[PDB]
């Protein structure tokens, strides 16, 4: 029930708080999941 991650994803996340802030991330990822990439014709 307890989750574990690679140390690179955990250590120093408190320190890199400013770099972990990116406007529009969750909205963009959601709409990325829902959009299709059409086959490259011609």
């Amino acid at each position: 029930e307890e989750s574990f991650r690679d140390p690179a994803e955990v250590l120093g996340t408190g320190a890199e708080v400013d770099y972990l802030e990116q406007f529009g991330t969750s909205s963009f990822k959601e709409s990325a999941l829902r959009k299709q990439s059409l086959y490259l014709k011609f």
């Binding site: 307890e2 989750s3 574990f4 991650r5 690679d6 140390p7 955990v10 250590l11 408190g14």
Partner: protein
Amino acid sequence: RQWALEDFEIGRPLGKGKFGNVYLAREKQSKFILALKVLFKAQLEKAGVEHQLRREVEIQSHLRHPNILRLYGYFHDATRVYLILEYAPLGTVYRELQKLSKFDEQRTATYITELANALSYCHSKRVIHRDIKPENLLLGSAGELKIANFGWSVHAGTLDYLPPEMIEGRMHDEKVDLWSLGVLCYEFLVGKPPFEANTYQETYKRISRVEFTFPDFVTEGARDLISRLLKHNPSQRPMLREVLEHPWITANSSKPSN
């Protein structure tokens, strides 16, 4: 073969402090669950405690006892020190005492039995460990005591657990641990330590003169043990084997059952 950060995956934080962080963690190959204490080199150097740290981890790494938190190993990278520790899942005795206010005689005798056992083992290795305050005692999964302030922490009182010979600035030895055990036994049963006072000056007085009183609910067996432990003269305090033989301890302690 050396320990490496690559050997581990890291879970939720268990505590944070100026010196670093403690995490729930897991060794990748075995999936063995443990705790990883992570210390900032910058803060250690800034505090000048690098020598002291090495000494403490060296000491803990050789203690192997069911009621002492194991240190399985240690390593470092460019900016951090990593201590691989036994995980104790049920929190501190401090918190349990908050929740319950006071412990009954069976819980107290049982805790004191586990501590005397751990301390006897420590003394057999010429190790003195006076600080056994409730906040330094973790609980294992079976509710057994784990002395948890070996190694290094991420972080009118405190004097509360100091013996007369220490506050008077005299030579002290392993018998300071017997005084601690008395203070702790009292605090377990009463809910506060026996020499508590408002000022530094007045707490010094009470300890130095060994002045304290029992609530009327404290039984004769308990009073007898605590009074033997809180003797001004260290050589008049019992040996730990004598604590483990005390009638009040033997009658009220328990081992696991259904």
